[PDB]
């Protein structure tokens, strides 16, 4: 079926304004409500292929993440696709040192929220939603010029009581 969003399953008239996804998300009331979200900060044009952020993750540089309850260097590393050793080295701790909740560690990349993560639109032309928002088709610029690619908004875009939420 769908991935995590499933918004296409209850949201109708799913059509974005270039990159601003707009769908009539069905609320628990059994009614439809016009919801709109910026996919321009979630979808990226990776070599002529629609991809969420960068596919899986990735980073570069030095950022600071806050350790949560029950997390270790190893968990942080796996979560932000960083090396637990590096995280440790940056904090002057060891990988198997085991960290504590409410701590701030230096990791090469953060998690993000919705600010400069996609930018597909910057190199996308004639962007249109198809199959009911479960698929998004556009001409993505790449090494070979322009290629028609698509992405499933229903993957992470879910309808939360008439509100388009990313998961």
mmCIF file with all atom_site columns, C-alpha atoms in Angstrom:
data_model
loop_
_atom_site.group_PDB
_atom_site.id
_atom_site.type_symbol
_atom_site.label_atom_id
_atom_site.label_alt_id
_atom_site.label_comp_id
_atom_site.label_asym_id
_atom_site.label_entity_id
_atom_site.label_seq_id
_atom_site.pdbx_PDB_ins_code
_atom_site.Cartn_x
_atom_site.Cartn_y
_atom_site.Cartn_z
_atom_site.occupancy
_atom_site.B_iso_or_equiv
_atom_site.pdbx_formal_charge
_atom_site.auth_seq_id
_atom_site.auth_comp_id
_atom_site.auth_asym_id
_atom_site.auth_atom_id
_atom_site.pdbx_PDB_model_num
ATOM 1   C CA . UNK A 1 1   ? 0.000   0.000  0.000   1.00 0.00 ? 1   UNK A CA 1
ATOM 2   C CA . UNK A 1 2   ? 1.312   3.418  0.994   1.00 0.00 ? 2   UNK A CA 1
ATOM 3   C CA . UNK A 1 3   ? 4.432   4.152  3.038   1.00 0.00 ? 3   UNK A CA 1
ATOM 4   C CA . UNK A 1 4   ? 4.000   6.289  6.132   1.00 0.00 ? 4   UNK A CA 1
ATOM 5   C CA . UNK A 1 5   ? 1.856   9.160  4.948   1.00 0.00 ? 5   UNK A CA 1
ATOM 6   C CA . UNK A 1 6   ? -1.185  7.482  3.393   1.00 0.00 ? 6   UNK A CA 1
ATOM 7   C CA . UNK A 1 7   ? -2.585  10.996 2.912   1.00 0.00 ? 7   UNK A CA 1
ATOM 8   C CA . UNK A 1 8   ? -3.672  10.031 -0.609  1.00 0.00 ? 8   UNK A CA 1
ATOM 9   C CA . UNK A 1 9   ? -5.861  7.444  1.080   1.00 0.00 ? 9   UNK A CA 1
ATOM 10  C CA . UNK A 1 10  ? -8.133  10.077 2.645   1.00 0.00 ? 10  UNK A CA 1
ATOM 11  C CA . UNK A 1 11  ? -7.051  13.355 1.053   1.00 0.00 ? 11  UNK A CA 1
ATOM 12  C CA . UNK A 1 12  ? -8.505  14.273 -2.297  1.00 0.00 ? 12  UNK A CA 1
ATOM 13  C CA . UNK A 1 13  ? -7.687  16.921 -4.903  1.00 0.00 ? 13  UNK A CA 1
ATOM 14  C CA . UNK A 1 14  ? -4.009  16.569 -4.117  1.00 0.00 ? 14  UNK A CA 1
ATOM 15  C CA . UNK A 1 15  ? -2.257  19.122 -6.337  1.00 0.00 ? 15  UNK A CA 1
ATOM 16  C CA . UNK A 1 16  ? 0.737   21.293 -5.481  1.00 0.00 ? 16  UNK A CA 1
ATOM 17  C CA . UNK A 1 17  ? 1.573   24.788 -6.555  1.00 0.00 ? 17  UNK A CA 1
ATOM 18  C CA . UNK A 1 18  ? 4.947   23.978 -8.023  1.00 0.00 ? 18  UNK A CA 1
ATOM 19  C CA . UNK A 1 19  ? 6.222   22.654 -4.734  1.00 0.00 ? 19  UNK A CA 1
ATOM 20  C CA . UNK A 1 20  ? 3.471   23.547 -2.260  1.00 0.00 ? 20  UNK A CA 1
ATOM 21  C CA . UNK A 1 21  ? 1.444   20.361 -1.864  1.00 0.00 ? 21  UNK A CA 1
ATOM 22  C CA . UNK A 1 22  ? -2.262  20.981 -1.490  1.00 0.00 ? 22  UNK A CA 1
ATOM 23  C CA . UNK A 1 23  ? -4.804  18.282 -0.675  1.00 0.00 ? 23  UNK A CA 1
ATOM 24  C CA . UNK A 1 24  ? -8.286  17.990 0.741   1.00 0.00 ? 24  UNK A CA 1
ATOM 25  C CA . UNK A 1 25  ? -7.304  15.930 3.766   1.00 0.00 ? 25  UNK A CA 1
ATOM 26  C CA . UNK A 1 26  ? -10.275 14.052 5.188   1.00 0.00 ? 26  UNK A CA 1
ATOM 27  C CA . UNK A 1 27  ? -10.622 14.764 8.898   1.00 0.00 ? 27  UNK A CA 1
ATOM 28  C CA . UNK A 1 28  ? -12.051 12.287 11.402  1.00 0.00 ? 28  UNK A CA 1
ATOM 29  C CA . UNK A 1 29  ? -15.321 14.199 11.081  1.00 0.00 ? 29  UNK A CA 1
ATOM 30  C CA . UNK A 1 30  ? -15.625 12.513 7.722   1.00 0.00 ? 30  UNK A CA 1
ATOM 31  C CA . UNK A 1 31  ? -15.100 15.833 6.015   1.00 0.00 ? 31  UNK A CA 1
ATOM 32  C CA . UNK A 1 32  ? -12.493 17.270 3.665   1.00 0.00 ? 32  UNK A CA 1
ATOM 33  C CA . UNK A 1 33  ? -10.301 20.227 4.540   1.00 0.00 ? 33  UNK A CA 1
ATOM 34  C CA . UNK A 1 34  ? -7.892  22.013 2.214   1.00 0.00 ? 34  UNK A CA 1
ATOM 35  C CA . UNK A 1 35  ? -4.417  21.392 3.562   1.00 0.00 ? 35  UNK A CA 1
ATOM 36  C CA . UNK A 1 36  ? -1.174  22.646 1.998   1.00 0.00 ? 36  UNK A CA 1
ATOM 37  C CA . UNK A 1 37  ? 2.485   21.898 2.795   1.00 0.00 ? 37  UNK A CA 1
ATOM 38  C CA . UNK A 1 38  ? 5.851   23.010 1.355   1.00 0.00 ? 38  UNK A CA 1
ATOM 39  C CA . UNK A 1 39  ? 7.345   19.964 -0.375  1.00 0.00 ? 39  UNK A CA 1
ATOM 40  C CA . UNK A 1 40  ? 10.033  22.281 -1.733  1.00 0.00 ? 40  UNK A CA 1
ATOM 41  C CA . UNK A 1 41  ? 11.796  21.690 1.573   1.00 0.00 ? 41  UNK A CA 1
ATOM 42  C CA . UNK A 1 42  ? 11.275  17.926 1.566   1.00 0.00 ? 42  UNK A CA 1
ATOM 43  C CA . UNK A 1 43  ? 11.712  16.812 -2.035  1.00 0.00 ? 43  UNK A CA 1
ATOM 44  C CA . UNK A 1 44  ? 15.048  17.044 -3.749  1.00 0.00 ? 44  UNK A CA 1
ATOM 45  C CA . UNK A 1 45  ? 15.994  16.555 -7.370  1.00 0.00 ? 45  UNK A CA 1
ATOM 46  C CA . UNK A 1 46  ? 18.811  14.053 -7.082  1.00 0.00 ? 46  UNK A CA 1
ATOM 47  C CA . UNK A 1 47  ? 20.280  13.637 -10.555 1.00 0.00 ? 47  UNK A CA 1
ATOM 48  C CA . UNK A 1 48  ? 16.856  13.774 -12.176 1.00 0.00 ? 48  UNK A CA 1
ATOM 49  C CA . UNK A 1 49  ? 15.206  11.680 -9.477  1.00 0.00 ? 49  UNK A CA 1
ATOM 50  C CA . UNK A 1 50  ? 12.809  12.896 -6.801  1.00 0.00 ? 50  UNK A CA 1
ATOM 51  C CA . UNK A 1 51  ? 14.291  12.126 -3.407  1.00 0.00 ? 51  UNK A CA 1
ATOM 52  C CA . UNK A 1 52  ? 13.355  13.049 0.158   1.00 0.00 ? 52  UNK A CA 1
ATOM 53  C CA . UNK A 1 53  ? 16.143  15.319 1.438   1.00 0.00 ? 53  UNK A CA 1
ATOM 54  C CA . UNK A 1 54  ? 18.995  13.105 0.218   1.00 0.00 ? 54  UNK A CA 1
ATOM 55  C CA . UNK A 1 55  ? 17.465  9.643  0.171   1.00 0.00 ? 55  UNK A CA 1
ATOM 56  C CA . UNK A 1 56  ? 18.439  8.447  3.612   1.00 0.00 ? 56  UNK A CA 1
ATOM 57  C CA . UNK A 1 57  ? 20.518  11.094 5.323   1.00 0.00 ? 57  UNK A CA 1
ATOM 58  C CA . UNK A 1 58  ? 24.038  12.463 5.169   1.00 0.00 ? 58  UNK A CA 1
ATOM 59  C CA . UNK A 1 59  ? 25.791  15.578 6.389   1.00 0.00 ? 59  UNK A CA 1
ATOM 60  C CA . UNK A 1 60  ? 28.990  17.565 6.421   1.00 0.00 ? 60  UNK A CA 1
ATOM 61  C CA . UNK A 1 61  ? 30.701  19.860 8.879   1.00 0.00 ? 61  UNK A CA 1
ATOM 62  C CA . UNK A 1 62  ? 30.118  20.215 12.600  1.00 0.00 ? 62  UNK A CA 1
ATOM 63  C CA . UNK A 1 63  ? 26.705  20.510 14.245  1.00 0.00 ? 63  UNK A CA 1
ATOM 64  C CA . UNK A 1 64  ? 25.341  19.769 17.718  1.00 0.00 ? 64  UNK A CA 1
ATOM 65  C CA . UNK A 1 65  ? 22.644  17.219 18.556  1.00 0.00 ? 65  UNK A CA 1
ATOM 66  C CA . UNK A 1 66  ? 20.933  16.767 21.942  1.00 0.00 ? 66  UNK A CA 1
ATOM 67  C CA . UNK A 1 67  ? 21.054  13.263 23.375  1.00 0.00 ? 67  UNK A CA 1
ATOM 68  C CA . UNK A 1 68  ? 17.706  11.840 24.441  1.00 0.00 ? 68  UNK A CA 1
ATOM 69  C CA . UNK A 1 69  ? 16.795  9.353  27.175  1.00 0.00 ? 69  UNK A CA 1
ATOM 70  C CA . UNK A 1 70  ? 18.199  5.913  26.413  1.00 0.00 ? 70  UNK A CA 1
ATOM 71  C CA . UNK A 1 71  ? 20.537  6.987  23.628  1.00 0.00 ? 71  UNK A CA 1
ATOM 72  C CA . UNK A 1 72  ? 24.244  6.235  23.231  1.00 0.00 ? 72  UNK A CA 1
ATOM 73  C CA . UNK A 1 73  ? 26.995  7.391  20.834  1.00 0.00 ? 73  UNK A CA 1
ATOM 74  C CA . UNK A 1 74  ? 26.167  4.338  18.752  1.00 0.00 ? 74  UNK A CA 1
ATOM 75  C CA . UNK A 1 75  ? 22.472  5.220  18.654  1.00 0.00 ? 75  UNK A CA 1
ATOM 76  C CA . UNK A 1 76  ? 23.174  8.845  17.782  1.00 0.00 ? 76  UNK A CA 1
ATOM 77  C CA . UNK A 1 77  ? 25.550  7.777  15.036  1.00 0.00 ? 77  UNK A CA 1
ATOM 78  C CA . UNK A 1 78  ? 23.046  5.341  13.545  1.00 0.00 ? 78  UNK A CA 1
ATOM 79  C CA . UNK A 1 79  ? 20.239  7.913  13.829  1.00 0.00 ? 79  UNK A CA 1
ATOM 80  C CA . UNK A 1 80  ? 22.065  10.803 12.128  1.00 0.00 ? 80  UNK A CA 1
ATOM 81  C CA . UNK A 1 81  ? 24.186  8.588  9.851   1.00 0.00 ? 81  UNK A CA 1
ATOM 82  C CA . UNK A 1 82  ? 27.301  9.717  11.717  1.00 0.00 ? 82  UNK A CA 1
ATOM 83  C CA . UNK A 1 83  ? 30.084  7.768  13.417  1.00 0.00 ? 83  UNK A CA 1
ATOM 84  C CA . UNK A 1 84  ? 29.670  7.223  17.145  1.00 0.00 ? 84  UNK A CA 1
ATOM 85  C CA . UNK A 1 85  ? 33.461  7.530  17.353  1.00 0.00 ? 85  UNK A CA 1
ATOM 86  C CA . UNK A 1 86  ? 33.437  10.999 15.814  1.00 0.00 ? 86  UNK A CA 1
ATOM 87  C CA . UNK A 1 87  ? 30.607  12.058 18.096  1.00 0.00 ? 87  UNK A CA 1
ATOM 88  C CA . UNK A 1 88  ? 32.679  10.838 21.011  1.00 0.00 ? 88  UNK A CA 1
ATOM 89  C CA . UNK A 1 89  ? 35.889  12.466 19.721  1.00 0.00 ? 89  UNK A CA 1
ATOM 90  C CA . UNK A 1 90  ? 34.106  15.810 19.373  1.00 0.00 ? 90  UNK A CA 1
ATOM 91  C CA . UNK A 1 91  ? 32.797  15.610 22.946  1.00 0.00 ? 91  UNK A CA 1
ATOM 92  C CA . UNK A 1 92  ? 36.111  14.166 24.203  1.00 0.00 ? 92  UNK A CA 1
ATOM 93  C CA . UNK A 1 93  ? 34.273  10.990 25.175  1.00 0.00 ? 93  UNK A CA 1
ATOM 94  C CA . UNK A 1 94  ? 34.583  7.435  23.861  1.00 0.00 ? 94  UNK A CA 1
ATOM 95  C CA . UNK A 1 95  ? 32.189  5.620  21.527  1.00 0.00 ? 95  UNK A CA 1
ATOM 96  C CA . UNK A 1 96  ? 31.401  2.858  24.034  1.00 0.00 ? 96  UNK A CA 1
ATOM 97  C CA . UNK A 1 97  ? 31.560  5.581  26.698  1.00 0.00 ? 97  UNK A CA 1
ATOM 98  C CA . UNK A 1 98  ? 27.773  5.672  26.726  1.00 0.00 ? 98  UNK A CA 1
ATOM 99  C CA . UNK A 1 99  ? 26.186  9.105  26.936  1.00 0.00 ? 99  UNK A CA 1
ATOM 100 C CA . UNK A 1 100 ? 23.295  10.508 28.973  1.00 0.00 ? 100 UNK A CA 1
ATOM 101 C CA . UNK A 1 101 ? 19.955  12.182 28.097  1.00 0.00 ? 101 UNK A CA 1
ATOM 102 C CA . UNK A 1 102 ? 19.956  15.948 27.922  1.00 0.00 ? 102 UNK A CA 1
ATOM 103 C CA . UNK A 1 103 ? 23.471  16.129 26.590  1.00 0.00 ? 103 UNK A CA 1
ATOM 104 C CA . UNK A 1 104 ? 24.723  17.934 23.498  1.00 0.00 ? 104 UNK A CA 1
ATOM 105 C CA . UNK A 1 105 ? 27.105  16.129 21.157  1.00 0.00 ? 105 UNK A CA 1
ATOM 106 C CA . UNK A 1 106 ? 28.876  17.391 18.064  1.00 0.00 ? 106 UNK A CA 1
ATOM 107 C CA . UNK A 1 107 ? 27.712  15.522 15.019  1.00 0.00 ? 107 UNK A CA 1
ATOM 108 C CA . UNK A 1 108 ? 28.441  16.220 11.308  1.00 0.00 ? 108 UNK A CA 1
ATOM 109 C CA . UNK A 1 109 ? 24.751  16.720 10.532  1.00 0.00 ? 109 UNK A CA 1
ATOM 110 C CA . UNK A 1 110 ? 21.467  17.572 12.234  1.00 0.00 ? 110 UNK A CA 1
ATOM 111 C CA . UNK A 1 111 ? 18.028  16.036 11.788  1.00 0.00 ? 111 UNK A CA 1
ATOM 112 C CA . UNK A 1 112 ? 16.266  19.003 10.283  1.00 0.00 ? 112 UNK A CA 1
ATOM 113 C CA . UNK A 1 113 ? 12.618  20.022 10.176  1.00 0.00 ? 113 UNK A CA 1
ATOM 114 C CA . UNK A 1 114 ? 11.837  21.829 6.946   1.00 0.00 ? 114 UNK A CA 1
ATOM 115 C CA . UNK A 1 115 ? 14.348  24.478 5.994   1.00 0.00 ? 115 UNK A CA 1
ATOM 116 C CA . UNK A 1 116 ? 16.577  23.841 3.014   1.00 0.00 ? 116 UNK A CA 1
ATOM 117 C CA . UNK A 1 117 ? 16.259  20.106 2.697   1.00 0.00 ? 117 UNK A CA 1
ATOM 118 C CA . UNK A 1 118 ? 14.857  19.549 -0.767  1.00 0.00 ? 118 UNK A CA 1
ATOM 119 C CA . UNK A 1 119 ? 15.028  22.332 -3.357  1.00 0.00 ? 119 UNK A CA 1
ATOM 120 C CA . UNK A 1 120 ? 13.761  20.067 -6.145  1.00 0.00 ? 120 UNK A CA 1
ATOM 121 C CA . UNK A 1 121 ? 11.761  23.024 -7.488  1.00 0.00 ? 121 UNK A CA 1
ATOM 122 C CA . UNK A 1 122 ? 14.960  25.014 -8.030  1.00 0.00 ? 122 UNK A CA 1
ATOM 123 C CA . UNK A 1 123 ? 15.695  22.593 -10.840 1.00 0.00 ? 123 UNK A CA 1
ATOM 124 C CA . UNK A 1 124 ? 12.201  21.213 -11.485 1.00 0.00 ? 124 UNK A CA 1
ATOM 125 C CA . UNK A 1 125 ? 9.862   22.202 -14.294 1.00 0.00 ? 125 UNK A CA 1
ATOM 126 C CA . UNK A 1 126 ? 6.189   21.429 -14.944 1.00 0.00 ? 126 UNK A CA 1
ATOM 127 C CA . UNK A 1 127 ? 5.640   19.905 -11.521 1.00 0.00 ? 127 UNK A CA 1
ATOM 128 C CA . UNK A 1 128 ? 2.295   18.154 -11.228 1.00 0.00 ? 128 UNK A CA 1
ATOM 129 C CA . UNK A 1 129 ? 0.724   15.618 -8.883  1.00 0.00 ? 129 UNK A CA 1
ATOM 130 C CA . UNK A 1 130 ? -0.510  12.360 -10.334 1.00 0.00 ? 130 UNK A CA 1
ATOM 131 C CA . UNK A 1 131 ? -2.421  9.296  -9.129  1.00 0.00 ? 131 UNK A CA 1
ATOM 132 C CA . UNK A 1 132 ? -3.983  11.344 -6.376  1.00 0.00 ? 132 UNK A CA 1
ATOM 133 C CA . UNK A 1 133 ? -0.907  12.834 -4.736  1.00 0.00 ? 133 UNK A CA 1
ATOM 134 C CA . UNK A 1 134 ? 0.613   9.421  -4.192  1.00 0.00 ? 134 UNK A CA 1
ATOM 135 C CA . UNK A 1 135 ? 2.939   10.368 -7.034  1.00 0.00 ? 135 UNK A CA 1
ATOM 136 C CA . UNK A 1 136 ? 4.527   13.683 -8.028  1.00 0.00 ? 136 UNK A CA 1
ATOM 137 C CA . UNK A 1 137 ? 5.846   14.109 -11.552 1.00 0.00 ? 137 UNK A CA 1
ATOM 138 C CA . UNK A 1 138 ? 8.175   16.837 -12.817 1.00 0.00 ? 138 UNK A CA 1
ATOM 139 C CA . UNK A 1 139 ? 11.131  17.574 -15.079 1.00 0.00 ? 139 UNK A CA 1
ATOM 140 C CA . UNK A 1 140 ? 14.203  17.443 -12.875 1.00 0.00 ? 140 UNK A CA 1
ATOM 141 C CA . UNK A 1 141 ? 17.445  19.013 -14.013 1.00 0.00 ? 141 UNK A CA 1
ATOM 142 C CA . UNK A 1 142 ? 20.542  16.839 -13.852 1.00 0.00 ? 142 UNK A CA 1
ATOM 143 C CA . UNK A 1 143 ? 23.855  15.927 -15.500 1.00 0.00 ? 143 UNK A CA 1
ATOM 144 C CA . UNK A 1 144 ? 21.931  14.891 -18.605 1.00 0.00 ? 144 UNK A CA 1
ATOM 145 C CA . UNK A 1 145 ? 19.837  18.034 -18.871 1.00 0.00 ? 145 UNK A CA 1
ATOM 146 C CA . UNK A 1 146 ? 16.224  17.468 -17.856 1.00 0.00 ? 146 UNK A CA 1
ATOM 147 C CA . UNK A 1 147 ? 14.552  14.164 -16.966 1.00 0.00 ? 147 UNK A CA 1
ATOM 148 C CA . UNK A 1 148 ? 11.001  13.330 -15.992 1.00 0.00 ? 148 UNK A CA 1
ATOM 149 C CA . UNK A 1 149 ? 11.025  11.930 -12.486 1.00 0.00 ? 149 UNK A CA 1
ATOM 150 C CA . UNK A 1 150 ? 8.436   11.298 -9.801  1.00 0.00 ? 150 UNK A CA 1
ATOM 151 C CA . UNK A 1 151 ? 8.054   10.783 -6.071  1.00 0.00 ? 151 UNK A CA 1
ATOM 152 C CA . UNK A 1 152 ? 5.434   9.388  -3.738  1.00 0.00 ? 152 UNK A CA 1
ATOM 153 C CA . UNK A 1 153 ? 4.151   12.155 -1.486  1.00 0.00 ? 153 UNK A CA 1
ATOM 154 C CA . UNK A 1 154 ? 2.018   9.522  0.236   1.00 0.00 ? 154 UNK A CA 1
ATOM 155 C CA . UNK A 1 155 ? 5.354   8.140  1.528   1.00 0.00 ? 155 UNK A CA 1
ATOM 156 C CA . UNK A 1 156 ? 5.832   10.605 4.308   1.00 0.00 ? 156 UNK A CA 1
ATOM 157 C CA . UNK A 1 157 ? 2.953   12.952 3.743   1.00 0.00 ? 157 UNK A CA 1
ATOM 158 C CA . UNK A 1 158 ? 0.086   11.862 5.946   1.00 0.00 ? 158 UNK A CA 1
ATOM 159 C CA . UNK A 1 159 ? -3.318  13.356 6.659   1.00 0.00 ? 159 UNK A CA 1
ATOM 160 C CA . UNK A 1 160 ? -3.723  14.221 10.318  1.00 0.00 ? 160 UNK A CA 1
ATOM 161 C CA . UNK A 1 161 ? -7.334  15.336 10.747  1.00 0.00 ? 161 UNK A CA 1
ATOM 162 C CA . UNK A 1 162 ? -7.375  17.524 7.655   1.00 0.00 ? 162 UNK A CA 1
ATOM 163 C CA . UNK A 1 163 ? -3.765  18.565 8.148   1.00 0.00 ? 163 UNK A CA 1
ATOM 164 C CA . UNK A 1 164 ? -0.869  17.447 5.944   1.00 0.00 ? 164 UNK A CA 1
ATOM 165 C CA . UNK A 1 165 ? 1.880   16.158 8.243   1.00 0.00 ? 165 UNK A CA 1
ATOM 166 C CA . UNK A 1 166 ? 5.284   14.755 7.291   1.00 0.00 ? 166 UNK A CA 1
ATOM 167 C CA . UNK A 1 167 ? 6.399   11.486 8.860   1.00 0.00 ? 167 UNK A CA 1
#
